[PDB]
Amino acid sequence: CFTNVYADSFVIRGNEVSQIAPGQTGNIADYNYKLPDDFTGCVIAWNS
Amino acid sequence: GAISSVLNDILSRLDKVEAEVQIDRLITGRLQSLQTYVTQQLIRAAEI
Structure with a gap:
């Protein structure tokens, strides 16, 4: 069970995902x- | 077992995740050197 929850969304060039x-x-x-x-x-x- | 005994050498050359565990080794080792010294001192104090 979770006390506060956020989804953050954004787009990345794959080689920086690291x-x-x-x-x-x-x-x-x-x-x-x-x-x-x-x-x-x-x-x-x-991928997108 | 760390890469170095010099703490800012580790912090400069390694990233926060890796640098932390290298320091941990140094913390665990040094804290052993103190517990050894204080145990040797508490035994040496008893014969004095």
């Missing part, structure tokens, strides 16, 4: 979408 995960460094993770080193949840990615 920056969404915690603490990593690079353009998407530094200037577009950073998630904290202390968060609970999941990252879903698929």
Whole structure:
């Protein structure tokens, strides 16, 4: 059971998808979408 | 078992996720060196 829940949605060039995960460094993770080193949840990615 | 004994060397060369576990090894090892010293001191204090 979950206390507060958010879905965040956005579009990524595939080779950067490896920056969404915690603490990593690079353009998407530094200037577009950073998630904290202390968060609970999941990252879903698929082609479009 | 860490990459280095110099803490800012680790933090400069490795990312937050990897750097943390390298420091952990250093925390676990150093904290063992203190418990050893304090146990040796508590035994040496008893014969004094």
